[PDB]
Amino acid sequence: TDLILGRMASTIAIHIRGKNLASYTPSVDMGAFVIVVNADKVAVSGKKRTQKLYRRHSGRPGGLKE
């Protein structure tokens, strides 16, 4: 709730790897499970809400999903 998206994603990433542990080896799974409640109320800054597109595409042309 009222957390901005990308910095929350980076600080979830830095625990999802295991780079807050002195046992960090980048070839094994030393990380930690995380749980993110209230995904419906994630803040963004500027004009992300109407201008940032999560487009995707299958293999065939003309399938780029706006």
Binding site: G18, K19, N20, L21, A22, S23, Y24
Partner: protein, 52 residues
């Protein structure tokens, strides 16, 4: 870096070298990253004597 950042207060890896060469410790050669996990109380003595 991941060993020093477990303090919570903003003490980075660069500041550990700030007060690792100002307090004259010639060249521990990053083998304190080895005894940082083989001897975590001894690296707590390292860092807690870097503070003083």
């Amino acid at each position: 870096n991941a060993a020093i950042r477990e303090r919570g207060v903003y003490y980075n890896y660069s500041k550990f070298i700030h007060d690792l060469y100002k307090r004259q410790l010639l060249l521990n050669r990053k083998i304190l990253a080895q005894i940082a996990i083989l001897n975590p109380n001894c690296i707590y003595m390292i860092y807690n004597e870097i503070i003083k």
